[PDB]
């Protein structure tokens, strides 16, 4: 919508400078803690093949050793221009998935460092006033700009008819949308693929032969937000 | 130009006021009727007409990009002022 | 292994629509008229189905338009008159079908504007 | 600055509002000006998305800086044009400064 | 046969010779962009938005004016075509004002939409814009002429369709302005249509100004009831309120036009409305009551009278559903005095044969006539869209038109034979020269206005005119299937009432004054309490408080035509139905439900409880009344003429003078238009 | 007594041929005999011809006239008028 | 200058203008130069003749020409404002 | 504001008001539009 | 061009060839194969082919579509078979996606795909819940998203947006009750479609 | 008219499944009244069950009957497993909804709806 305010990038740099230490303090409390390990190690084990067939994604796949990350395999935006490592687990349990998330946080800091250094100049929205609204100064001076502002904010832009399934590596796994266009300016159908929908469907499987308190840890390791599960 | 009706209720700049028999004015009992008292019709009529030396003048409301879309106003008629349809400022050829 | 049903397809009992919004509603099946403010014809291609307008009253608090008609905004699009009729029948809705109006072909002749002996001659351009 | 309302009842904000939280009616004012007679925002429908202030061509409707306006009743969150105009007169000193600081990014 | 082959992007099309490139593209389903071209006006070819590339030709052609040749391949999406559109759109917008937020066309603007689809997305115009002064042309059409794009649609419409040569272009070049030059008002019964055909916000509805945007309005396709033409309309509503009235295209009735009464009188529906039942208190003043009490009072009086002691009168805006319900109710107390305010001679056949009181040629059939004789009618104000159809035939078919009556302005030149009704005797006898024109004619048409039938000698006139049609059909001039005799009605409810067996006129009520009288929307003032026993019990059912309500004992608030699904039959006998756009105000109810409810309380319950059932009843009385949008056709003109000759009634000396002579008499004619503040501004403007 | 007569018929169908012949031959003579009686003839395409009679107090009777002849139609009205 | 007329005491529909008898004879010859049924072709020469008699074209002069040739007054206004040799002041 | 005071406007409130909810000065919503349909008023004389 | 999405010709050829491959191997069920301009391959199949087609794509060595990414339904009331069942599958081996579509109406059951993908269990419950499409041989087919006792299938095009009933707490009966829906402000329907064609490349024939 | 079936291949097969559903619903009412502590009588609950079955008696399409039985069994499970709360079970009775006028005159007085 808008360009970064002047001075924002320096502040993001200041935050990113100190963040790894904050992750280090988190690990000091949990990583080697025998109580934390007793609550997580060998809890909710899922095999690589079962994870794929149950429709898992994200850390739920990578905790079982599956080498899959949509940012690597099917990159979008500029993810193919940044360097990072995908954390992979070996035992497929809650503890390995916990370590994957903590390592993914470190890699996010690594990626943020490259974005701050490689940020290029230029415009922020597609220079195409039939999709992206023109600048307010243009809208108040140019006849074409005002017309396009008026139409984009009332009818909206029309999308050519068609259907796409588009997915990204969301923090919770593969988040996708099956978007159907009928040629008008309103979507005809919009199915939302929430990564937690399939994950919560696997809770029954993952909890077999565990204690009542291990269910708490297993819903925890899947990281469920019922906003996306329920839509 | 706020004013009160016979019942003592203030009339809004839109001309709204509950009539005598209207029960809906019970909502103000023990409270107040929110009324803005800077009537725009009266404030814009206090502005002095601007004298210009051309048949056509443009108005953007002032402030450049902080105003309204720029429009051009014809001043050929000498029986009336040219008014801006966005901000209500008036112009007259001198 | 397929079976045979000689009956008329009806699903009124398995759609969950209250009874009064089946039997008392009137569906209108029509091709929308061109908005006469514009010359575009792209909004007169498909068939629509709408229902009978019901009461809208003024909300006592704000003056907003209130309604108790759950089908007040329901508009369905159909490729053909027969797709619309079939959908109305299986849903149990009584309906009126209005035949599509097509603009009659015209005879446009620019030369007629300058006729030697006919009233089609224009006095101005 | 003259005191005339910026809003010209174009209804672009009402059209773009993702929540249908804006209700507008308009008519020619006694001086022939194109102005609203109703301008309501249901603050319990609004998602505070700012789309209305992006759509407005004259900077008439804005989201101000106030966030400390919780009420004791639902009805107090159904704003009409008088309430919104009073909010403009109340907060204009700060709204104008905020707009001055950000209008070059818009 | 005589078709020729052309291609649109390679797809073969067979077109009639003379078909333009634009018309060829329609067949394959492409709409070429346009501004100046309108299919019902003359080709202008000035906007240049329709420029298209013909394959192999180096120059783009104006598709709206260029006749397509054999073997041409029209490239409607080539770069040369696309760049032509972008260039023209760039020039149209160079001086256009940045007005969309304050402009009423915004949201349904062809300039906006064709800019989005066919123009560029930005500007490179770095100068200042043209600005022009506004023109005042009446209280209906607001002009913001800086928005004008000089398409000349208004000028062509005013001259060809309305027959008014008051709009033109003055000046030259970039400073060419559309207008009247002098301070003039464009006040025509069809004037409001230039709002629709102006592609931009230059011409806009003054009453509609600033009130709504097009995306938020709900559209209800309905029927006009301001005259007997039955013009198809769209009622725009928003949040329960009627916002405006637009034409709805119907080639066989109104085409895409409506009259200024149809367009603008709708504001009368918000004034002087009956919202509650009323009865007379002990002091003789009307006071609000309940539906319980008002219906019980009427049911009590109804149960105590029989036969001639109960009568009813139907006004000009009453639906067929209400008409048959009131007939059935009074037929259960044994009353047949079901009357209308509009007279039609009951001599001879009367209403036995439908052809005796219809526009038997149909409105579309005017375009096939070669001679039209108008008798005692100002069709310009009685049936504006029927008069516009005559001018279309006059302009395009070279139609010959003669008139008997006042020499009113019809917007086209015609042969005035005089106003004395004895000319009809001369024409039929053969002495008048015009009879030679009628005999030579191969498809002649005779129209007698229903207004002329309001005279005391209406029966003699109908016999005299019906005789002329007898003469033509005995000669060989006509092919048989062609119908010559026509009655032009002016009242929306007249034809349905005649179809249902109502007695036209209030002569029966004058002959046997009733003790109880129903006024069903009757506001013509044809019967007053001076025509009734000293203690007549008058019940008025209607939607407006005008002439009937003040004198009634009981008032029953009904619905207007925008507030019910009701059947109306137009002058040619076509049955059409309205639809509910908004519900009736207050406690008002659907008119046939009031009679159905009243019948139950009176102990004479009618045998129908839904709109579908009362329409099945309409089918029993006249099957044509439920054949919506169908013109049925009536025969036995021969039998009607034989019956019309039994009784010889003489013609009065009075010259035929139509009720409406000038435009000032056109605007206010029924209760709705009499309550319209827009119509009162029109009346004031054309006098002051 | 009798109050109204309505005759329905199709303009083109053979089922209404007899009724069409009656109107073209006998209707004028019938109306002259009964000048105070509404005999509403209403044509509509594809309708089965019928004869409606309205008696006092809204009582109604309808007699099919399908595939009737002109003389058969004459008798049917004679029954109503008698 | 402008292309819209506003009545003034010097220039209004009742400003006295009429062709002299000599100019009516000239008008007859001008009109005779064109096919019968196309008298509108005489608008330009007759407006010029009005201006040659009068010096300029008051609105009343324009209305007289429209009346002589039986063309709508607007169609004479369009000619008067289109061609630059006509003096409307 | 001591260093960069706000621009002066004559419609700007001279007196700031804090939150008035729960007091007799609280805002109470109402419809700001005028009545849409004017009813017919019968005559005051009993001519009937 | 800076504002135009670039075309990938190699993936369009690749997905076309694989589309013919699947059509040649499964002719009993495949009715149509198409690839979009943004390179998504869609297989349209007869509904009887759900299990054979999905099993082939999961298990075949050149397919290996091991992950069911999504399963949803689209309601198109104008069609005789109004419901379109859409399977979106992912192949990690070949780093590719495929979409498999079939159809059904209100009374015709579709075969549960739970045997092929355990992921389908809840998706089919959601399709049943929200569209009313029955899946045969489903281990536990019941509503999943709607309230207990909810009548109707909300994602059908002819189900009203605000439904038919609404909830409130009633003091007289001391419980939450359901009543016919009334709205203080009705939802305002907008007609936004422009009357001018936007995309000639998609024009339907006259 | 050759269509894929759901369960029943004809109406006689379907009627059997309908009767089993009625038995299951009939026997569960006394438990439902007790577990949910309803304030209706067992006879009232069973009358409602009959009312719900009754208003589908006109159906002659075996596929439609199977769906009606399928839906009815799901409702029974929700009740048997106590997934429904007290509020859900009592929605069949509309206790807070005032009686709706049915005759013409009553509907004419209240408003415009037929
Ligand atoms: S901020 Fe609120 S009122 Fe403005 S557009 Fe968003 S939801 Fe609507
Ligand atoms: S606030 Fe702005 S966008 Fe909304 S109606 Fe007023 S001027 Fe238009
Ligand atoms: S005519 Fe169209 S483009 Fe011109 S200002 Fe009005 S809405 Fe905008
Ligand atoms: S006013 Fe409108 S219709 Fe007339 S020329 Fe200008 S744009 Fe065309
Ligand atoms: S539409 Fe052809 S030039 Fe205007
Ligand atoms: K316009
Ligand atoms: Zn301005």
Distance between the termini of chain G: 9 Å
Based on CA atoms alone, the radius of gyration of chain G comes out at 13 Å
- Spatial ordering of strands, largest sheet of chain I: 1-2-5-4-3
Ligand species = iron/sulfur cluster, FE2/S2 (inorganic) cluster, potassium ion, zinc ion
Distance between the termini of chain I: 34 Å
Task: Report the order of strands and helices of chain G.
Answer: HHHH
Structural class of chain G: mainly alpha
The two chains with the largest interface, and their residue counts, are: C-E, 44 and 58 residues
Strand content of chain G: under 5%
Order of helices and strands of chain I: HEEHEEEEHEEE
Report on the biggest sheet of chain G: none
Percent helix among the residues of chain G? 40-55%
Helix content of chain I: 10-25%
**Count of beta strands of chain I:** 9
User: Count of helices of chain I?
Assistant: 3
Family (chain C): Belongs to the complex I NDUFS4 subunit family.
Region (Disordered) (chain C): 99-125
GO molecular function (chain C): NADH dehydrogenase (ubiquinone) activity
Protein name (chain C): NADH dehydrogenase [ubiquinone] iron-sulfur protein 4, mitochondrial
What does the model show?
Chain A: It is found in: Mitochondrion inner membrane. Chain A: It comes from Bos taurus (Bovine). This is part of a larger assembly, with ten protein chains of ten kinds. Chain B has 94 residues and is mainly beta. Chain B has one helix at 40-44, and strands spanning 3-4, 10-11, 50-52, 56-59, 71-74, 82-83, 90-93. Chain B is elongated. The two termini of chain B are 32 Å apart. Chain I has 206 residues and is α/β, with parallel strands linked by helices. In chain I, 19% of the residues lie in helices and 26% in strands. In chain I, the strands form three sheets. In chain I, strands 1-2-5-4-3 form a five-stranded mixed β-sheet, covered by helices on one side. Chain I has a two-stranded parallel sheet with strand order 6-7. Chain I is globular. Chain J has one domain. Chain J has five helices and one strand. Chain J has helices at 11-35, 42-54, 62-80, 86-89, 104-110; one strand at 2-3. Chain J is flat. Chain E binds chain F through residues 328, 331-334, 336, 349-354, 499, 501, 620-624, 627, 630, 632-636, 638-639, 642-643, 646, and chain F through 3-4, 6, 8, 11, 23-24, 27-28, 31-32, 38-45, 47, 52, 54, 56-58, 60, 62. Strand 1 of chain C pairs antiparallel with strand 1 (2-3) of chain J, so a sheet runs across the interface. The structure holds iron/sulfur cluster (4 copies), FE2/S2 (inorganic) cluster, potassium ion and zinc ion (ZN). The site of one iron/sulfur cluster has 13 residues of chain D, from helix 1.
């Amino acid at each position: 919508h808008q360009d970064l305010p002047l001075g924002l990038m320096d502040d993001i740099y200041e935050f990113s400078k100190n963040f790894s230490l904050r992750i280090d303090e988190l690990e000091e409390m949990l990583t080697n803690n025998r109580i934390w390990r007793n609550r997580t190690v060998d809890i909710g084990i899922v095999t690589a093949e079962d994870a794929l067939n149950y429709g898992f994604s994200g850390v739920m796949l990578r905790g079982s050793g599956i080498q899959w990350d949509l940012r690597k395999t099917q990159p979008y935006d500029v993810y193919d221009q940044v360097e990072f490592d995908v954390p992979i687990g070996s035992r497929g349990d809650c503890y390995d998935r916990y370590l994957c998330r903590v390592e993914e946080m470190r890699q996010s800091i690594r990626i943020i460092s490259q974005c701050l250094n490689k940020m290029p100049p230029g415009e922020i929205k597609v220079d195409d006033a039939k999709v992206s609204p023109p600048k307010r100064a243009e809208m108040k001076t140019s006849m074409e700009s005002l017309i396009h502002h008026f139409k984009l904010y009332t009818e909206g832009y029309q999308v050519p008819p068609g259907a796409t399934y588009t997915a990204i590596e969301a923090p919770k796994g593969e988040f996708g949308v099956y978007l159907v266009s009928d040629g008008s300016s309103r979507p005809y159908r919009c199915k939302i693929k929430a990564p937690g929908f399939a994950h919560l469907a696997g809770l029954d499987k993952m909890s077999k032969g565990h204690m009542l308190a291990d269910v708490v840890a297993i819903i925890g390791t899947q990281d469920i937000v019922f906003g996306e599960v329920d839509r | 130009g706020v004013r009160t009706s016979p019942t003592g209720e203030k009339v809004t700049h839109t001309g709204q006021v509950y009539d005598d028999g209207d029960y809906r004015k019970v909502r103000f009992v023990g409270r107040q009727k929110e009324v803005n008292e800077n009537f725009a019709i009266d404030l814009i009529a206090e502005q002095p007409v601007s004298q210009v030396g051309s048949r056509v003048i443009s108005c953007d409301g002032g402030g450049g990009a902080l105003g309204h879309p720029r429009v051009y106003i014809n001043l050929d008629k000498e029986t009336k002022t040219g008014t801006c349809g966005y901000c209500g400022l008036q112009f007259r050829q001198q | 292994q397929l079976i045979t049903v000689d009956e008329k397809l009806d699903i009124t009992t398995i759609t969950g629509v209250p009874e009064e919004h089946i039997k008392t509603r009137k569906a209108r099946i029509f091709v929308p008229a061109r908005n006469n403010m514009q010359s575009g014809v792209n909004n007169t291609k498909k068939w629509k189905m709408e229902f009978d307008t019901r009461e809208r009253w003024e909300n006592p608090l704000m003056g907003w338009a209130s309604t108790a008609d759950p089908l007040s905004n329901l508009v369905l699009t159909f490729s053909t008159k027969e797709d619309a009729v079939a959908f109305a029948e299986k849903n149990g809705w009584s309906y009126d079908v209005e035949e599509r109006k097509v603009p009659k072909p015209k005879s446009k002749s620019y030369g007629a504007n300058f006729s030697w002996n006919k009233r089609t001659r224009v006095s101005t351009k | 600055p003259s005191g005339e309302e910026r809003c010209i009842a174009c209804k672009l904000c009402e059209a773009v509002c993702p929540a249908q939280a804006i209700t507008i009616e308009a008519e020619p004012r006694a001086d022939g000006s194109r102005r609203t007679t109703r301008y309501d925002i249901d603050m319990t429908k609004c998602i505070y998305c700012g789309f209305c202030q992006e759509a407005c061509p004259v900077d008439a409707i804005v989201e101000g800086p106030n966030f400390e306006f919780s009420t004791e009743t639902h009805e107090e969150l159904l704003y009409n044009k008088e309430k919104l105009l009073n909010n403009g007169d109340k907060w204009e000193a700060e709204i104008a400064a905020n707009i001055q600081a950000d209008y070059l990014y818009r | 046969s005589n078709l020729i082959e052309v291609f649109v992007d390679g797809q073969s099309v067979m077109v009639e010779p003379g078909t333009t490139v634009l018309q060829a593209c329609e067949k394959v389903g492409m709409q070429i962009p346009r501004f100046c071209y309108h299919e019902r006006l003359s080709v202008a070819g000035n906007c240049r938005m329709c420029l298209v590339e013909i394959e192999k030709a180096p120059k783009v052609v104006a598709a709206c004016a260029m006749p397509v040749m054999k073997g041409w391949n029209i490239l409607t999406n080539s770069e040369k075509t696309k760049k032509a559109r972008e260039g023209v759109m760039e020039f149209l917008l160079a001086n256009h004002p940045l007005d969309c937020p304050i402009c009423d066309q915004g949201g349904e603007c062809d300039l906006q939409d064709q800019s989005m689809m066919f123009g560029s997305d930005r500007s490179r115009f770095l100068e200042g814009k043209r600005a022009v002064e506004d023109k005042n042309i009446g209280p209906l059409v607001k002009t913001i002429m800086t928005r004008c794009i000089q398409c000349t649609r208004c000028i062509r419409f005013a001259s060809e369709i309305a027959g008014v040569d008051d709009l033109g272009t003055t000046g030259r070049g970039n400073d060419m302005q559309v207008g009247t030059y002098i301070e003039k008002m464009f006040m025509s019964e069809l004037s409001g249509n230039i709002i629709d055909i102006c592609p931009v916000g230059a011409l806009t509805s003054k009453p509609y100004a600033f009130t709504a945007r097009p995306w938020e309005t709900r559209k209800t396709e309905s029927i006009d009831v301001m005259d007997a033409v039955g013009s198809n309309i769209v009622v725009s509503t928003r949040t329960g309120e009627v916002m405006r009235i637009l034409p709805r295209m119907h080639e066989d009735i109104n085409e895409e036009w409506i009259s200024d009464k149809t367009r603008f009188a709708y504001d009368g529906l918000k004034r002087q409305r009956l919202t509650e039942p009323m009865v007379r208190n002990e002091k003789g003043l009307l006071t609000h009551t309940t539906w319980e009490d008002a219906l019980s009072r009427v049911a009590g009086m109804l149960q105590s009278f029989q036969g001639n002691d109960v009568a009813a009168i139907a006004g000009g805006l009453v639906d067929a559903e209400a008409l048959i319900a009131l007939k059935d109710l009074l037929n259960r107390v044994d009353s047949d005095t079901l009357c209308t305010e509009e007279v039609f001679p009951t001599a001879g056949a009367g209403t036995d044969l439908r052809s005796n009181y219809l526009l038997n040629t149909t409105i579309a059939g005017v375009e096939e006539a070669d001679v039209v004789l108008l008798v005692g009618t100002n069709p310009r104000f009685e049936a504006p869209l029927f008069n516009a159809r005559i001018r279309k035939s006059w302009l395009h078919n070279d139609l010959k038109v003669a008139l008997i009556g006042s020499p009113v302005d019809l917007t086209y030149r015609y042969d005035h034979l005089g106003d004395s009704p004895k000319i009809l005797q001369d024409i039929a006898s053969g002495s008048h020269p015009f009879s030679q024109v009628l005999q030579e004619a191969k498809k002649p048409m005779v129209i007698l206005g229903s207004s002329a039938l309001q005279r005391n000698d209406g029966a003699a006139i109908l016999a005299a005119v019906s005789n002329i049609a007898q003469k033509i059909r005995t000669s060989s001039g006509v092919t048989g299937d062609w119908k010559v005799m026509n009655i032009l009605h002016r009242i929306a409810s007249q034809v349905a009432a005649l179809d249902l067996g109502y007695k036209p006129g209030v002569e029966a009520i004058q002959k046997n004054p009733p003790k109880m009288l129903f006024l069903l929307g009757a506001d013509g003032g044809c019967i007053t309490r001076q025509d009734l026993p000293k203690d007549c019990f008058i019940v008025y059912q209607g939607h407006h408080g005008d002439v009937g309500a003040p004198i009634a004992d009981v008032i029953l608030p009904g619905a207007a035509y925008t507030e019910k699904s009701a059947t109306y039959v137009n002058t040619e006998g076509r049955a059409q139905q309205t639809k509910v756009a908004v519900t009736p105000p207050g406690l008002a109810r659907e008119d046939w439900k009031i009679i159905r409810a009243l019948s139950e309380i009176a102990g004479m319950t009618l045998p129908y409880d839904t709109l579908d059932q009362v329409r099945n009843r309409l089918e029993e009385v006249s099957p044509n009344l439920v054949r919506y949008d169908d013109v049925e056709g009536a025969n036995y003109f021969q039998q009607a003429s034989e019956l019309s000759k039994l009784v010889n009634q003489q013609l009065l000396a009075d010259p035929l003078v139509p009720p409406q002579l000038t435009i000032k008499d056109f605007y206010m004619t029924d209760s709705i238009s009499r309550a319209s503040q827009t119509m009162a501004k029109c009346v004031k403007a054309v006098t002051e | 007594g009798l109050r109204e007569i309505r005759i329905h018929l199709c303009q083109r169908s053979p089922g209404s041929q007899g009724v069409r012949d009656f109107i073209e031959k006998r209707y004028v003579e019938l109306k002259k005999a009964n000048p105070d009686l509404p005999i509403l003839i209403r044509e509509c395409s594809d309708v089965q011809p019928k004869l409606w009679a309205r008696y006092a107090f809204g009582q109604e009777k309808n007699v099919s006239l399908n595939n009737f002849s002109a003389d058969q139609v004459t008798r049917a009205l004679e029954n109503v008028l008698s | 200058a402008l292309f819209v007329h506003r009545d003034t005491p010097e220039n209004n529909p009742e400003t006295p203008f009429d062709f002299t008898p000599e100019n009516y004879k000239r008008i007859e010859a001008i009109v005779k130069n064109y096919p019968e049924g196309h008298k509108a072709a005489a608008v330009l020469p007759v407006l010029d003749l009005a201006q040659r008699q009068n010096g300029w074209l008051p609105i009343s002069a324009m209305n007289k020409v429209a009346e002589i040739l039986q063309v709508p007054p607007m169609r004479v206004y369009e000619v008067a404002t289109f061609y630059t040799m006509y003096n409307r002041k | 504001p001591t260093v960069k005071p706000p621009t002066a406007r004559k419609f700007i409130w001279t007196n700031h008001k804090f939150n008035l909810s729960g007091t007799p000065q609280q805002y109470v919503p109402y419809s700001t539009t005028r009545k849409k349909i004017q009813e017919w008023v019968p005559p005051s004389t009993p001519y009937k | 061009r800076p504002t135009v999405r670039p075309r990938n010709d190699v993936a369009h050829k690749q997905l076309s060839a694989f589309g013919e491959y699947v059509a040649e191997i499964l002719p009993k069920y495949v009715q149509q194969v198409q690839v979009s301009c943004f390179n998504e391959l869609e297989i349209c199949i007869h509904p009887d082919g759900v299990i054979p087609v999905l099993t082939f794509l999961r298990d075949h060595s050149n397919a290996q579509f091991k992950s069911l990414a999504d399963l949803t339904a689209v309601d198109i009331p104008t069609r005789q078979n109004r419901f379109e069942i859409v399977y979106n599958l992912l192949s990690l081996r070949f780093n590719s996606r495929i979409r498999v579509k079939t159809y059904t109406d209100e009374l015709t059951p579709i075969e549960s795909s739970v045997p092929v993908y355990k992921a389908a269990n809840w998706y089919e419950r959601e399709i049943w819940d929200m569209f009313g499409v029955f899946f045969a041989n489903h281990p536990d087919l019941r509503r999943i998203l709607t309230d207990y006792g909810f009548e109707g299938h909300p994602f059908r095009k002819d189900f009203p947006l605000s439904g038919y009933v609404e909830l409130r707490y009633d003091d007289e009966v001391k419980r939450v009750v359901a009543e016919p829906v009334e709205l203080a402000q009705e939802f305002r329907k907008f007609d936004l479609n422009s009357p001018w064609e936007a995309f000639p490349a998609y024009r339907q024939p006259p | 008219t050759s269509v894929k079936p759901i369960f029943s291949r004809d109406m006689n097969e379907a009627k059997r499944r309908v009767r089993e559903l009625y038995r299951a619903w009939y026997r569960e009412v006394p438990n439902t009244v007790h577990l949910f502590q309803l304030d209706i009588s067992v006879k009232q609950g069973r009358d409602k069950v009959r009312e719900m079955f009754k208003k589908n008696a006109h159906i002659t399409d075996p596929r439609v009957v199977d769906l009606l039985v399928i839906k009815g069994k799901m409702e029974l499970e929700e009740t048997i497993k106590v997934w429904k709360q007290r509020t859900h079970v009592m929605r069949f009775f509309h206790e807070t909804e005032a009686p709706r006028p049915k005759d013409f005159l009553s509907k004419f007085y209240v408003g415009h709806d037929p």
